[PDB]
């Protein structure tokens, strides 16, 4: 599938607002994922002991992790689909080290959309949410293809 330049600009205009405070956005997204789909938290050996949103918010390691996740996603989005080099290591790690199914990438996509919709109504109206959904769908389609190449059913 392929996004138009106008769709990419809607993605990158909301991402510019994430980048005012990537750490706070990462906390909100990870907490939303873990609350909405608690089974995902069991994939994190470092974090699966956290019992409450307050503990999650207070975890410095979780905050640093969210910064890495959103910075990797932002680098992918800034490639506007030309993200083969960035996806290779991400897909190998997520298939073979972490064992993250596509369904769980769908859950984090939903958490990203939920947090952006909540924080950024000025840059996340219906057209912008549709563009971000297309971008995340493209990311998941290309990860799924790489999973299959790597031998992981996902
Ligand atoms: C937008 C989708 C995602 C992106 C861009 C992403 C990106 C990353 C990155 C960059 C790291 C490495 C951080 C480091 O250098 O230490 C990481 C680690 C990890 N990811 Fe993801 N990830 C995504 C989705 C998920 C999901 C949905 C799960 C689980 C449900 C997951 C599970 C993990 C695990 C278990 C680690 C290792 C964490 C640790 O070192 O303690 N990822 N991810
Ligand atoms: C990956 N979190």
Curated annotation (Swiss-Prot):
It is found in: Cytoplasm, Sarcoplasm. Residues 2-148 form the Globin domain. Monomeric heme protein which primary function is to store oxygen and facilitate its diffusion within muscle tissues. Reversibly binds oxygen through a pentacoordinated heme iron and enables its timely and efficient release as needed during periods of heightened demand. Depending on the oxidative conditions of tissues and cells, and in addition to its ability to bind oxygen, it also has a nitrite reductase activity whereby it regulates the production of bioactive nitric oxide. This is Myoglobin. Its main location: cytoplasm. Heme b binds at residue 94. It catalyses: Fe(III)-heme b-[protein] + nitric oxide + H2O = Fe(II)-heme b-[protein] + nitrite + 2 H(+); H2O2 + AH2 = A + 2 H2O.
């Amino acid at each position: 599938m392929v996004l138009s330049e106008g769709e990419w600009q809607l993605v990158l205009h909301v991402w510019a607002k994430v980048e005012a405070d990537v750490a706070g956005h990462g906390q909100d997204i990870l907490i939303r994922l873990f609350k909405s789909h608690p089974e995902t938290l069991e994939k994190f050996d470092r974090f699966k002991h956290l019992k409450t949103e307050a503990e999650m918010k207070a975890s410095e390691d979780l905050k640093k992790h969210g910064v890495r996740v959103l910075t990797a996603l932002g680098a992918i989005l800034k490639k506007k689909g030309h993200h083969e080099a960035e996806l290779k290591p991400l897909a190998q790690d997520h298939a073979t080290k972490h064992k993250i199914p596509i369904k769980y990438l769908e859950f984090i996509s939903e958490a990203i959309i939920h947090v952006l919709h909540s924080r950024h109504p000025g840059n996340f109206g219906a057209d912008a949410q549709g563009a971000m959904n297309k971008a995340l769908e493209l990311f998941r389609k290309d990860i799924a293809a790489k999973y299959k190449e790597l031998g992981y059913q996902g």
